[model samples]
Target: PLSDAEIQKYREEINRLDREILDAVKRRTKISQTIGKTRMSSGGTRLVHTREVAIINQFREEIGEEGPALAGILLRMGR
Candidate 1:
């Protein structure tokens, strides 16, 4: 007999989160541009190394081996 695949059912939820993730990314990019524009206009440094390193370390702690890499890609993605 043919049977439905449970794994296939998870696709909708997976896509839901994927869409949300992209939505968040777009929002984050806007925020990044805003902050950079405002900060530079207001005499702030181009990039804050300590702040970024802190975020990278946080990702490393939460997601382990691949987290920092992921963090790097995301950080650059918005810029």
Candidate 2:
């Protein structure tokens, strides 16, 4: 357990982290939804494995070593 000062410091850090996470997540979800809408307009399926795979591959390549695991996680996330 942390002392009062330590807990307060951690709370401040967590608040900052939360703000960053919320902004990023909002952007990601919005973009994903927009892509879904574009696919619908084009008569393409919303749940596209090919696109998902491409996304994963790009992430994996960008992240280098940890990319495969991230991609695998994303593939499962699609289900």
What's the distance in Å from true for residue 53, model 2? 8.1
TM-score of each: 0.74, 0.47
Q: What TM-score would you give candidate 1 relative to the actual structure?
A: 0.74
Q: Give the Cα lDDT of each candidate.
A: 0.77, 0.70
How many clashes in candidate 2? 1
Off by over 4 Å in 2: 37-47, 50-79
Deviating ranges (above 4 Å) for candidate 1: 1-3, 37-47
Q: Residue 79 error for model 1, in Å?
A: 2.6
Q: Give the per-residue lDDT of model 1 (tens digit) for 1-79.
A: 3336666667777999999989998898888876653325323443566678888999999989998998898789756
- What's the true lDDT of residue 13 in model 2? 100
State the weakest 10-residue window (summed lDDT) of model 1: 37-46
For candidate 2, give the lDDT: 0.70
